[PDB]
Amino acid sequence: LNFKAIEEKWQKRWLEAKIFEPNIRDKPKEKKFYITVAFPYLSGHLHVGHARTYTIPDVIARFKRMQGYNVLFPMAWHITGSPIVGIAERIKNRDPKTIWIYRDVYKVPEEILWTFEDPINIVKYFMKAAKETFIRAGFSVDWSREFYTTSLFPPFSKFIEWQFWKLKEKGYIVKGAHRVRWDPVVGTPLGDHDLMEGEDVPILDYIIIKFELRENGEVIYLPAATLRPETVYGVTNMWVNPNATYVKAKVRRKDKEETWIVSKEAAYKLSFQDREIEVIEEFKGEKLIGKYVRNPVSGDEVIILPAEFVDPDNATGVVMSVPAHAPFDHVALEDLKRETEILEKYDIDPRIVFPAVEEVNKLGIKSQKDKEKLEQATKTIYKAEYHKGIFKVPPYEGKPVQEVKEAIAKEMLEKGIAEIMYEFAEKNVISRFGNRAVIKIIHDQWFIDYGNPEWKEKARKALERMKILPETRRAQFEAIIDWLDKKACARKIGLGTPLPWDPEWVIESLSDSTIYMAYYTISRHINKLRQEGKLDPEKLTPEFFDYIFLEEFSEDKEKELEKKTGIPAEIIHEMKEEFEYWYPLDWRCSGKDLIPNHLTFFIFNHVAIFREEHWPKGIAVNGFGTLEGQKMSKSKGNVLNFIDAIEENGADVVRLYIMSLAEHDSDFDWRRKEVGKLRKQIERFYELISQFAEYEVKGNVELKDIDRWMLHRLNKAIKETTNALEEFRTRTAVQWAFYSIMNDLRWYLRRTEGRDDEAKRYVLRTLADVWVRLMAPFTPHICEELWEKLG
């Protein structure tokens, strides 16, 4: 029933005797097994979905120790980035939503919570929480190698500097243009997750089509912003908010200078997007109505009509109407007033398609210019049209809309007909200073150039040589490697390691976490030196790391490194032996959500820096977990913390349950009723083994047919459980290791009810030995206890 005592007993033994801190001398390199799993970010408690991610490698590590490998399974903490910095500030301001999440979902005591205004307290609290939770879960971690990231952990920070100098020397670090969140009042870059409000909000790439308004003036453009540039071939008129203030302005870039008319808000925004803006005058909105403009694509000339649905504070403030496909434009066309002129009803709606002018929706739920919710109509159309839908218009006859959009935009762009304006999907993006953010284009953003073709090739080579579990994910990896472009690798805000040649930037979270597995190998020695007060991180130069990771052993280099570092040549030598022994990493594990980013970056960074013999050998990914049928959401409060699940059900029960539900990229669904039922079966498994352990087997026995049947079923389960685990098939392994044996055993006991002789006791005791062994990787605590009972 209660296993709290057994779990505590075994965790104390594992920790106090440092059972899981391996010594490389115990076995030759041929029997080494090194596995790591993406370290957690310390902004809060890990939940049961995370529990799966971290339990799989533990199961495998324990399975490997049982097979005879010398195993290393370490753990460390990620604290790089701006979220923790942002969260601290929100609690400082007493933001209701943040407070509630930390109180109700994470159960942080009230008084402790206010100390989180200092991001360092958030880090310390959740570091302690994550470590205890991993120890309470029975994870067989070599804690001597523990560390955390950023400049707050000098020795690791130095290792990161080395990594980045290496990338630089190879020409993999590039400076360039980028668009970032910016506070226009303070005039300063913002942290993406250090906002007062609007952190999920994406920056959108609006295509601004420069319609031509000609009237005695040699240069006047009315840039209409659209997310459907392909609909340029069907614009029947223009939209503008007659009540909104528009400006006529001089727009110059480099040496090109034009004159445009956009909303007053657009003019301010554009000033931060690589353009000099000088407003000429405010012109209301109605002052434009009735005017005609030329469609720079389809030579047509159209009218600028009134419409209170257009938002002057969205993109340019100018919209191009396409009623056949834009619900808003249709119901907007609906007229029945006086205005100024009326030549209406004239000119139909050119379609480009299921009716020609797909206005079903905009007439399938009623309408009216601003009844709102009109977007649900545009949602369905926009969604559909993108999926299927073939282009009607001549230039792109029978072409997929998705293709036409890409082509048209590509064409207007490299012709000057259209330009790009960045805009937030929502209007509530607010900085920590309390001001609405703007998007600013900068020219000095640092990138890691994953787009380098030579680099991509070496990455394909490394991928080819490694195992991918499930193999069905190999295609996605190949595609990510082909399609990857340079990636912003540093930020102005957040905790991290300063870019060594430009300290004003700190290396970003997905960029300081691609090869730290190499650091784990030397972490025990570094921590011992550090605790001994015999370490000056400043002496951990690129030269030192070059010797450790890239050079041939040299007693002379060790001797000269000893003089420069203050670290005994022998210790330096041992550190290098740890790395040479444990690498290459046998397995890198993580959620499937890291395939497009971290996991692929992990491959690139390894081929860019390490010798070939040290490239990764395998990646195993897992799916997600939902709770009672729903996604776990902190804002909704339906999150089950891993530590709470352990307290309530027992660690072995949580582990077996989660492992039993799914394998590879399949997801699982946590159900209280199922875990309760599994717990009862685990308790029965425990009692049965305890009962069988009392039997004493004598000499040889005379087996009956049912006994031989049972013995054969045990061998079957051993084989299948082992075959499944070699492939990280945790669900299939549990079906054999736990369910099959329990099912076979129950039938065995029914068939032998009333019988009790030596042959039967021999079968049952033999089963108990086999069963505890197959279950150990899953339920390690009760299995250690049962092994003592057995003898």
Tell which phi-psi region holds residue 276, choosing left (phi > 0), alpha (psi between -120 and 50) or beta. beta
- CB contact at 8 A, 37 and 60: no
Residue 189, number of CB atoms within 10 A of its CB: 17
Residues 423 and 473 in one domain: no
What is the rounded CA–CA span in Å between residue 554 and residue 573?
A: 9
- Half-sphere exposure at residue 687, Cβ-oriented, CA atoms within 13 angstroms: 8
Tokens of 121: 């307290």
- CB contact at 8 A, 440 and 273: yes
Residues 6+ apart with CB under 8 A from 169: none
Q: What are phi and psi of 578, to 5 degrees?
A: -60, -50
- CB contact at 8 A, 240 and 318: yes
- CB contact at 8 A, 219 and 439: no
Q: Which residue has the tokens 């979270």?
A: 509
What is the rounded CA–CA span in Å between residue 245 and residue 544?
A: 63
Helix axes 672-693, 758-775, angle to 10 degrees: 130
Q: Which residue has the tokens 């033999």?
A: 766
Residue 538, number of CB atoms within 10 A of its CB: 9
What is the rounded CA–CA span in Å between residue 243 and residue 286?
A: 7
Residue 312, preceding peptide bond in cis (omega within 30° of 0):
no
Residues 6+ apart with CB under 8 A from 727: 469
Residues 6+ apart with CB under 8 A from 200: none
What is the rounded CA–CA span in Å between residue 158 and residue 27?
A: 31
Residues 197 and 207 in one domain: no
Residue 238's CATH number: 3.90.740.10
**Torsion of the alpha carbons at 186, 188, 194 and 200, rounded to the nearest 10:** 100
Residues 6+ apart with CB under 8 A from 189: 180, 181, 182, 440, 442, 491, 492, 493
What is the rounded CA–CA span in Å between residue 748 and residue 513?
A: 52
Measured CA distances, 789 to 546, 683, 694, 763, 782 (Å):
51, 15, 8, 17, 11
Measured CA distances, 508 to 154, 176, 447, 598, 688 (Å):
16, 16, 10, 12, 53
Q: Give the domain-ending residue among 384, 399, 428.
A: 428
203 has which bridge partners? 424
Residues 6+ apart with CB under 8 A from 414: none
**Torsion of the alpha carbons at 557, 558, 559 and 564, rounded to the nearest 10:** 90
What is the rounded CA–CA span in Å between residue 302 and residue 320?
A: 10
- CB contact at 8 A, 790 and 772: yes
Residues 6+ apart with CB under 8 A from 14: 20, 138, 140
What is the rounded CA–CA span in Å between residue 681 and residue 738?
A: 10
By the 10 Å C-beta count (0-12 exposed, 13-18 middle, 19+ buried), 10 is classed as buried
Helix axes 154-169, 598-609, angle to 10 degrees: 70
- 141 secondary structure, DSSP code: -
Three-class secondary structure assignment of 227-275 = CCHHHHHHCCEEEECCCCCEEEEEEEECCEEEEEEEEHHHHHHHCCCCC
Kindly report the length of the chain.
791
Residues 167 and 228 in one domain: no
Nearest to 706 by CA among 673, 756, 752: 752
What ranges in 444-597 are assigned the alpha helix state H?
A: 453-464, 474-483, 516-531, 542-550, 555-565, 569-582
Residue 783's CATH number: 1.10.730.10
What is the rounded CA–CA span in Å between residue 653 and residue 441?
A: 52
| Sheet of 490-491, strands arranged across | 490-491, 502-507, 498-499
What is the rounded CA–CA span in Å between residue 35 and residue 20?
A: 13
What is the rounded CA–CA span in Å between residue 141 and residue 138?
A: 9
Residue 125, number of CB atoms within 10 A of its CB: 21
What is the rounded CA–CA span in Å between residue 91 and residue 118?
A: 9
- 31 secondary structure, DSSP code: G
Q: Specify the 3-state DSSP secondary structure of 487.
A: strand
Report helix, strand and coil shares of the chain as percent, to nearest 5. 45, 20, 35
What is the rounded CA–CA span in Å between residue 268 and residue 276?
A: 10
Q: How remote is the C-alpha of 205 from its chain's centroid?
A: 22
Tokens of 626: 């939902």
Residue 531's CATH number: 3.40.50.620
419 has which bridge partners? 208
Tokens of 18: 């440092």
What is the rounded CA–CA span in Å between residue 55 and residue 656?
A: 9
- CB contact at 8 A, 325 and 299: no
Tell which phi-psi region holds residue 242, choosing left (phi > 0), alpha (psi between -120 and 50) or beta. alpha
Tokens of 538: 């400043």
- CB contact at 8 A, 133 and 47: no
Residues 6+ apart with CB under 8 A from 39: 75, 76, 77, 78, 513, 516
- CB contact at 8 A, 312 and 318: no
Nearest to 38 by CA among 589, 584, 473, 658: 589
Q: Give the domain-ending residue among 670, 689, 708.
A: 670
β-strands 70-72, 32-37 pairing? parallel
| Burial state string for 24-51 with b = 16 or more CB within 10 A and e = fewer than 16 | beebeeeebbbbbbbbbbbbbbbbbbbb
Q: Specify the 3-state DSSP secondary structure of 172.
A: coil
Residue 123, number of CB atoms within 10 A of its CB: 21
418 has which bridge partners? 209
Residues 583 and 709 in one domain: no
β-strands 438-448, 173-183 pairing? antiparallel
Nearest to 495 by CA among 191, 47, 97: 191
- 340 secondary structure, DSSP code: S
- CB contact at 8 A, 118 and 88: yes
- CB contact at 8 A, 191 and 491: yes
Residues 496 and 645 in one domain: yes
- CB contact at 8 A, 754 and 706: no
- CB contact at 8 A, 644 and 47: no
What is the rounded CA–CA span in Å between residue 175 and residue 177?
A: 7
What is the rounded CA–CA span in Å between residue 723 and residue 717?
A: 10
Q: Which residue has the tokens 């500030």?
A: 89
Identity of the residue numbered 117: E
Nearest to 776 by CA among 693, 656, 657, 677: 656
Residues 6+ apart with CB under 8 A from 594: 38, 621
Nearest to 260 by CA among 294, 219, 232: 219
Tokens of 122: 């958030």
For the chain, the maximum distance between any two Cα atoms, rounded to a whole number of angstroms, is 113
Helix axes 780-789, 672-693, angle to 10 degrees: 20
Three-class secondary structure assignment of 379-434 = HHHHHHHHHCCEECCHHHCCEEHHHHHHHHHHHHHCCCCEEEEEEECCCCCECCCC
What is the rounded CA–CA span in Å between residue 250 and residue 756?
A: 99
By the 10 Å C-beta count (0-12 exposed, 13-18 middle, 19+ buried), 23 is classed as exposed
By the 10 Å C-beta count (0-12 exposed, 13-18 middle, 19+ buried), 642 is classed as buried
Looking at 84-227, which runs of residues are DSSP E strands?
173-183, 188-189, 203-212, 221-226
180 has which bridge partners? 440
What is the rounded CA–CA span in Å between residue 770 and residue 598?
A: 39
Q: Which residue has the tokens 């009862």?
A: 680
β-strands 418-424, 203-212 pairing? antiparallel
Tokens of 748: 């065995």
282 has which bridge partners? 247
Q: Give the domain-ending residue among 616, 647, 670.
A: 670
What is the rounded CA–CA span in Å between residue 287 and residue 241?
A: 10
What is the rounded CA–CA span in Å between residue 22 and residue 13?
A: 15
By the 10 Å C-beta count (0-12 exposed, 13-18 middle, 19+ buried), 72 is classed as buried
84 has which bridge partners? none
What is the number of domains present in the chain?
3
- CB contact at 8 A, 56 and 12: no
Domain that holds residue 722: 671-791
By the 10 Å C-beta count (0-12 exposed, 13-18 middle, 19+ buried), 386 is classed as middle
Residues 417 and 495 in one domain: no
Task: Evaluate the CA torsion angle 419, 422, 423, 424 in order and state its sign.
Answer: positive
Interior CA angle at 55 toward 7 and 465, to 5°?
145
First to last CA, the chain: 23
What is the rounded CA–CA span in Å between residue 246 and residue 244?
A: 6
What is the rounded CA–CA span in Å between residue 167 and residue 161?
A: 10
- CB contact at 8 A, 643 and 136: yes
Residues 217 and 318 in one domain: yes
Residues 416 and 456 in one domain: no
Tokens of 273: 């997007």
Measured CA distances, 619 to 35, 36, 322, 396, 778 (Å):
10, 10, 48, 43, 21
- CB contact at 8 A, 469 and 619: yes
Rg of the chain on CA atoms, in Å: 32
Residues 318 and 418 in one domain: yes
Tokens of 314: 């969205």
Residues 42 and 96 in one domain: yes
What is the rounded CA–CA span in Å between residue 152 and residue 160?
A: 12
What is the rounded CA–CA span in Å between residue 630 and residue 548?
A: 48
Q: What are phi and psi of 171, to 5 degrees?
A: 75, 25
Q: Which residue has the tokens 């790439």?
A: 205
β-strands 292-294, 188-189 pairing? unpaired
Tokens of 481: 């490697």
Residue 93, number of CB atoms within 10 A of its CB: 13
What is the rounded CA–CA span in Å between residue 316 and residue 209?
A: 10
Helix (H) or strand (E) holding 88: helix 83-92
What is the rounded CA–CA span in Å between residue 252 and residue 49?
A: 52
Q: What are phi and psi of 207, to 5 degrees?
A: -90, 125
What is the rounded CA–CA span in Å between residue 3 and residue 1?
A: 7
Which residues of the chain come before a gap where C and the next N are over 2.5 Å apart?
Answer: 353
Tokens of 257: 């200078």
Residue 537, preceding peptide bond in cis (omega within 30° of 0):
no
| 634 in a known ligand binding site | yes
Tokens of 653: 């029960």
Resolution in units of Å: 2.0
Residue 117, number of CB atoms within 10 A of its CB: 16
Q: Specify the 3-state DSSP secondary structure of 467.
A: strand
Identify the experimental approach.
Answer: X-ray
- CB contact at 8 A, 484 and 450: yes
Helix axes 741-751, 672-693, angle to 10 degrees: 50
| Burial state string for 445-464 with b = 16 or more CB within 10 A and e = fewer than 16 | bbbbbbebeebbebbeebbe
Residues 291 and 398 in one domain: yes
What is the rounded CA–CA span in Å between residue 268 and residue 284?
A: 16
Q: What is the DSSP secondary-structure string of 643-692?
A: HHHHHHH-HHHHHHHHHHH--TT--EEE-HHHHHHHHHHHHHHHHHHHHH
71 has which bridge partners? 33
Residues 679 and 639 in one domain: no
What is the rounded CA–CA span in Å between residue 623 and residue 668?
A: 7
Measured CA distances, 122 to 117, 136, 181 (Å):
8, 21, 25
β-strands 487-488, 438-448 pairing? antiparallel
Tokens of 708: 């031989």
Measured CA distances, 13 to 18, 135, 678, 679, 776 (Å):
8, 12, 27, 24, 16
